[PDB]
Design a protein around this nucleic acid. Structure first.
Ligand SMILES: [Zn+2]
Lengths: 123, 25, 93, 52, 48, 201, 333
RNA sequence: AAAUAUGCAAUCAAUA
RNA sequence: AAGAUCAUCGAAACGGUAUGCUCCUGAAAAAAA
RNA sequence: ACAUUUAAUGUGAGGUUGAGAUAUAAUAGUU
């Protein structure tokens, strides 16, 4: 409890969960899953700007700094902003935005391979 | 800014729910 | 002699807006010239805003007292274009 | 009469799951009642108040 | 009503009005806190 | 502190002198026309492509690519869409489809509710009191007395922010316009639309 | 100020004028009481307004017009207060200031003296009902054939009755057609063929009581917006860019600006007008996409960014260059 | 004990 | 909120100047080992 | 929700008074 990462209230501003199962992860994992599941997203949608991000579908490429830095650029620091963003203006959870993006992309849940769901927080 | 304030911001992130290291590396 | 009495718009006993627009109170010959020029052009000056009235007054005074080369506007804008826009926005009744 | 087929069964042929239908109806209601602030590019300029 | 200087309306009516007022105040606070921003118009991951 | 040296302009300087003064801020006060706006945008894009680039540009482009991939952009499909200019705006549609009472003796809601708005009065003032144009309506779902599916639809549509569970109350706000009458009309229209959508459940 | 030459300016004349103004204020208060007793509003003013009965509207308008006609014009005040409380209080205050104040303490206690008068206390709770008490409620309900002003409501009802009588002489059908309630909302203005777009004009006072623009009136857009149930951006929702991406962007912008505070209606209109033309004269969105994507690949390689020299090296190394074709003091000396 | 699963500020019960 | 309580790994395992890639603001904090 | 289109749009070509001295034809034909 001294340094437990939930606060006293067990806040999970970055956690996301699937309502179809008990699977849950965070925003960085969601971004990684989105980059890995481009083929499914592109197939559902259906040299070119559309496929420009395909190279990032490789696990080894992402593990390499060449891909890790791209991952960290895409997934910035939602909990870090300007210094004036304090008190009543502290950052809020972007879990809603991430869930909306995932649902619109129709990315599949790793544990149940569903299509929708992916509510905010942790179930 | 100050190292103490940087650590405070990291602790705030941890309380909000982001596991980040406290090492001053 | 003396200034002509103002015409109340509706449900009023006076109107400083008309006197200001005509430049009678406060008296300002440049504003009187602006009013006369806009009336001749066909712009309902009473319907204009204070900002536009002052802008037109300044432009007319500069043109009169410095030459027809002035005023000069950027982006190839012209005083004639400004006058046309004002006329289109506030047709004279 | 008691028809075996239901409207849900008839709709299922197209591929509209009940969960998807519920979510689509909720989203349509929310868009009708609240607005179209979907965070599209350039929406920040329109949502940002002026200060002139 | 009987006592001078006191509100003549029904105490239960006042209770219901107060409960409604408190509920709407809670709703207003929740909505305002959720919608508050320091940089209004900014949404995460949108072109900044 | 002394006089600045005086320079007698040469014939060449006088002959090669601008006949008009440079553009000032007083002139900039005039807004930029859309032609100039578009020309500046085109020039900046052309220069950036020509090579005055930056790492921030690459990062921004990658972020935009991610947004397009998740589908939150205005890009148009080459095969799905490519292979109207006039439309009815949502508020106009709401007004057009709204049903209004024939006379003050007719009620178009039929359920208990309370309407709240704020008005400001005081001595003479030159500045209008801010934050006095919004209005809202509060009601109890139990009083609305709907079926379970309809109640669930209402709660889901209004979200958890507009629902207070302690007393089972629900509130709808409207502060979209600076005029209280306009906000009230919009609030009524949206309340009617919300009830229609709930009944659709 | 010169000594008195004409008795018109003498002090007793001023005292007499103040007394006459106070007498006129008392007469006006008496007339208002008589009007209230002669034409009472059954059930309360608010209930009468909400019910909107012809007799109630007629009685209220008659009483209001009689009060307006009977309201005097005082000599020592240039504010024609419609409230008898305000008129009487101002007259009393003027008299007290003129010939009742010994010192600063009295000049400060004048207001307490006025507030301690029982008649003013009684008149304090007899002012007219401000429009905003019911106008927002009527707008929320959705009443468009309404007016908080009693005289205006009476005028509307009487005009409708006159038009109905013109036909009253397949006849009930024609009478109903002429009746105001049975007029399509789309036909109110040609340019807005949509229903429920026009509302009832608010009776709230508008304008500047005193300034260089005391009688300016409403603005061009304000006059129009005061006559709508609530504003819509249907004016600019046409002739959008033919490019599909730009059309979608402008449509989204219009939809968002319809529901957005902090933006004026004129600002939104001008923004849409400029944006439409900007997109129209810009290049195709797909071409821009291709060019930008080719110029900025996913991974940033070396040498793909313009090299930049240090500021000190570029500038802070002494006088080395001046840009002037015609200068009498070049860098050579 | 078929109750709980437990860290504390600088505003608000005249209303949480 | 921290310094907490409790309970582990544990001594230059201290220190954090320095270092191109990343993030935030803004029209603009660029290049670079 | 029931929702193409007020008239043009040709060359591979996108930069419409140039965002500017200071060695490389580099870029939007070749060089
Ligand atoms: Zn799942």
């Amino acid at each position: 409890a001294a340094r437990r990462v939930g606060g006293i209230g067990r806040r999970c501003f970055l956690t996301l969960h699937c309502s179809a199962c008990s699977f849950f992860f965070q925003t960085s994992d969601a971004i990684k899953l989105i980059l890995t599941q481009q083929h499914h997203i592109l197939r559902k949608k259906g040299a070119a700007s559309k496929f420009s991000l395909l190279p990032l579908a490789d696990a080894s490429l992402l593990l390499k700094r060449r891909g890790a830095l791209v991952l960290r650029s895409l997934h910035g620091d939602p909990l870090v902003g300007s210094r004036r963003q304090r008190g009543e203006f502290a950052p809020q959870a972007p879990t809603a935005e991430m869930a909306k993006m995932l649902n619109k992309s129709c990315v599949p849940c790793p544990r149940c391979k569903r299509e929708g769901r992916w509510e905010e927080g942790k179930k | 800014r100050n190292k103490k304030i940087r650590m405070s911001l990291k602790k705030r992130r941890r309380r909000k729910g982001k596991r980040a290291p406290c090492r001053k590396k | 002699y003396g200034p002509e009495a103002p015409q109340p718009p509706a449900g009023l006993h006076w109107s400083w807006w008309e006197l200001y627009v005509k430049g009678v109170n406060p008296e300002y010959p440049p504003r009187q010239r602006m009013f006369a020029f806009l009336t001749a052009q066909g712009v309902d000056v009473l319907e204009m805003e204070i900002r536009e009235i002052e802008d037109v007054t300044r432009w007319l005074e500069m043109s009169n007292v410095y030459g027809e080369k002035f005023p000069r506007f950027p982006y190839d804008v012209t005083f004639q274009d400004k006058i046309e826009a004002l006329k289109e926005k506030y047709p004279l009744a | 009469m008691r028809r075996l087929a239901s409207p849900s069964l008839r709709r299922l042929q197209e591929g509209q799951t009940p969960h998807s239908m519920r979510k689509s109806a909720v989203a349509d209601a929310r868009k009708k009642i609240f607005g179209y602030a979907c965070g599209m590019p350039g929406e920040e300029q329109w949502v940002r108040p002026l200060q002139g | 009503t009987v006592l001078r200087g006191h509100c003549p309306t029904d105490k239960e009516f006042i209770r219901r009005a107060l409960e409604e007022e408190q509920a709407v105040e809670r709703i207003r606070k929740k909505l305002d806190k959720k919608q508050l921003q320091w940089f209004p118009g900014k949404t995460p991951w949108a072109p900044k | 502190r002394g006089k600045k040296e005086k320079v007698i302009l040469n014939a060449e300087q006088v002959a090669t002198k601008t006949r008009l003064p440079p553009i000032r801020l007083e002139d900039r006060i005039t807004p930029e026309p859309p032609a100039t706006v578009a020309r500046n945008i085109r020039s900046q894009i052309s220069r950036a492509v020509a090579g005055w680039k930056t790492k921030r540009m690459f990062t921004y482009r990658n972020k935009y690519r991610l947004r397009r991939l998740v589908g939150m952009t205005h890009d148009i499909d080459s095969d799905d869409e490519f292979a109207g200019r006039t439309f009815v705006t949502p508020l106009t549609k709401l007004q057009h489809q709204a049903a209004l009472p024939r006379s003050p003796l007719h009620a178009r809601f039929d359920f208990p509710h309370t309407v709240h708005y704020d008005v400001f009065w005081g001595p003479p003032q030159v500045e209008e009191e801010p934050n006095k144009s919004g209005c809202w309506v509060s009601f109890r779902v139990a009083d609305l007395k709907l079926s379970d599916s309809q109640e669930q639809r209402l709660l889901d549509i209004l979200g958890p922010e507009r629902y207070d569970e302690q007393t089972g109350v629900v509130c709808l706000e409207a502060d979209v316009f600076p005029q209280l009458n306009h906000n009230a009309a919009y609030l009524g229209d949206i309340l009617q639309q919300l009830m229609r959508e709930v009944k659709k459940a | 100020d010169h000594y008195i030459t004409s008795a018109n300016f003498s002090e007793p004349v001023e005292l007499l004028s103040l007394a006459e103004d106070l007498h006129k204020a008392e007469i006006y208060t008496q007339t208002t009481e008589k009007l209230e007793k002669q034409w009472p509003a059954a059930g309360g003013v608010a209930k009468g307004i909400q019910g909107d009965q012809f007799f109630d509207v007629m009685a209220a308008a008659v009483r209001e017009d009689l009060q307006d006609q009977s309201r005097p014009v005082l000599v020592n005040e240039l504010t024609d207060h419609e409230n008898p409380y305000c008129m009487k209080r101002e007259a009393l205050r003027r008299l007290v200031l003129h010939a009742c104040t010994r010192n600063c303490l009295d000049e400060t206690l004048t207001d307490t003296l006025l507030d301690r008068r029982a008649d003013l206390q009684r008149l304090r709770s007899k002012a007219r009902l401000p429009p905003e008490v019911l106008e927002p409620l009527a707008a929320f309900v959705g009443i468009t054939r309404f007016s908080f002003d009693r005289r205006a409501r009476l005028n509307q009802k009487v005009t409708a009755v006159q038009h109905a009588l013109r036909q009253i002489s397949e006849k009930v059908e024609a009478v109903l057609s002429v009746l105001p309630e049975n007029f399509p909302s789309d036909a109110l203005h040609p340019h807005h063929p949509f229903r429920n777009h026009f509302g009832f004009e608010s009776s709230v006072p508008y304008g500047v009581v005193g300034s260089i623009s005391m009688g300016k009136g409403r603005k061009k857009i304000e006059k129009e917006l005061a006559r709508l149930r609530y504003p819509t951006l249907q004016r600019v929702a046409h002739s959008l860019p033919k490019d599909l991406k730009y059309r979608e962007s402008v449509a989204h912008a219009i939809r968002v600006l319809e529901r957005s505070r902090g933006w004026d209606f004129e600002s939104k209109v001008k923004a849409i007008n400029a944006l439409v033309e900007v997109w129209n004269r810009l290049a195709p969105g797909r071409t821009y996409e291709k060019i930008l994507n080719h110029a900025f690949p996913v991974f940033r390689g070396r040498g793909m960014v313009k090299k930049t020299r240090s500021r000190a090296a570029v500038f802070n190394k002494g006088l080395k260059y001046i840009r002037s074709l015609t200068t009498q003091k070049p860098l050579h000396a």
